[PDB]
UniProtKB/Swiss-Prot annotation, chain B:
Its EC number(s): 3.6.1.13, 3.6.1.58, 2.7.7.96
Matches recorded under Pfam families: NUDIX
Name of the protein described by the UniProt record: ADP-sugar pyrophosphatase
Modified residues (Phosphothreonine): 34
Domain Nudix hydrolase stretches: 46-186
Protein task: Enzyme that can either act as an ADP-sugar pyrophosphatase in absence of diphosphate or catalyze the synthesis of ATP in presence of diphosphate. In absence of diphosphate, hydrolyzes with similar activities various modified nucleoside diphosphates such as ADP-ribose, ADP-mannose, ADP-glucose, 8-oxo-GDP and 8-oxo-dGDP. Can also hydrolyze other nucleotide sugars with low activity. In presence of diphosphate, mediates the synthesis of ATP in the nucleus by catalyzing the conversion of ADP-ribose to ATP and ribose 5-phosphate. Nuclear ATP synthesis takes place when dephosphorylated at Thr-34.
Record-linked CDD domains: NUDIX_ADPRase_Nudt5
Amino acid sequence: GKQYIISEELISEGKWVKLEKTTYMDPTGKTRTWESVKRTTRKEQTADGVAVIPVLQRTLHYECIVLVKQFRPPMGGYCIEFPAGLIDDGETPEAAALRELEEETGYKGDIAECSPAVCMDPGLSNCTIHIVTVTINGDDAENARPKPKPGDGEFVEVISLPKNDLLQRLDALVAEEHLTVDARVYSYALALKHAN
Amino acid sequence: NGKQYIISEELISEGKWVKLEKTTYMDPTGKTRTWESVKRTTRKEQTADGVAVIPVLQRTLHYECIVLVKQFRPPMGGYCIEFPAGLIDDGETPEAAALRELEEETGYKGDIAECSPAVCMDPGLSNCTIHIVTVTINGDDAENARPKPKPGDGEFVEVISLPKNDLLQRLDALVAEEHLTVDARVYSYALALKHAN
Ligand SMILES: Cn1cnc2ncnc(N3CC[C@@]4(CCN(c5ccc(C(F)(F)F)c(Cl)c5)C4)C3)c21
Ligand SMILES: Cn1cnc2ncnc(N3CC[C@@]4(CCN(c5ccc(C(F)(F)F)c(Cl)c5)C4)C3)c21
Ligand SMILES: [Mg+2]
Ligand SMILES: [Mg+2]
Ligand SMILES: [Mg+2]
Ligand SMILES: [Mg+2]
């Protein structure tokens, strides 16, 4: 009944990603194969990366979610995402969240909560992240004029949409700008509307 | 400030289901860069590779439930809690795929509520895209009294209905209880529900 991995064979390994053929035992006692994807960068970390839900709080204003718009070569187009990135060797999820947030948007934030490791596309890959909810005090002088510090090859546009109408604003962006919205962002947006 | 685009896409390795390409693209400064990209081989004329279904089970004098599925995922080497999901067949509408997948995996006959534009699953890694299809399930209808699944070859599914009003804590309890990974879309949905109250 219980399924498990028998063995993994490397098909192709690049600098960043690899393709494996996975042999596994199905519930009926029959062994099957599966073409799996993995990052090559995972080490002693609980997950590959962090995604940050940055809630920007200014008084006398709506709460905003801070998103980033980037060109994504795999997608061959621009995407709207939660700020995200790899957890560095020895770095905690919480710390990687704040750093990524500051690198991509400039905002200095405070941890609110940190998810367990969640899978990005379990049908395709073993990639996991921690989803980290961060509040940004946008009345602090820190965040008055936020200063992005992007690394080499990081071209990032910051986009702050209101929480209270996030789903509609995202759909407007897709129709207007012909962007692709991230699935995690859209799931979040949906739930806000579906809450009772 | 210049706009970015694909220059070329060179195949590195193609399987029956997934392949790895080397993408060359132009960055904003006018310098060419490369990227190791993942793509599914099954895509054709569909607006997306697949669908994920948010099934809201509605019953009189019961709290709304979200219907999730637990499956072994070879890439993860373990069981995962996910929204019902699969590929869109050739010529199939996303809505039609959502309903089919939900009935095959769970046995529930849903009704369409809303359907998203194509959204990306992991755009830093792959081009994989889906429509997120919100579906209501009338639990009081007799068709949905005792749902009869019908999984295809190599499909092995457990149905898990958690209340909407307490989804996040119920998922936490499931992770604490056994070795399990919650899907990122599931967790993001549950987070928003909490954050909305
Ligand atoms: C069947 N099979 C055998 N070796 C394989 N080797 C590799 N893959 C396989 N599959 C079959 C098709 C799939 C089953 C689950 N799939 C899937 C599940 C979920 C999603 C969604 F919507 F969440 F994104 C999508 Cl797009 C697709 C397709 C991967 C393999
Ligand atoms: C830099 N680079 C050059 N060729 C490449 N070829 C391939 N890859 C690359 N990268 C670099 C690292 C990454 C940049 C964005 N990344 C990333 C972005 C998002 C997530 C998250 F958390 F959302 F899942 C994660 Cl885990 C990682 C890593 C992929 C390549
Ligand atoms: Mg306010
Ligand atoms: Mg980074
Ligand atoms: Mg970054
Ligand atoms: Mg299926």
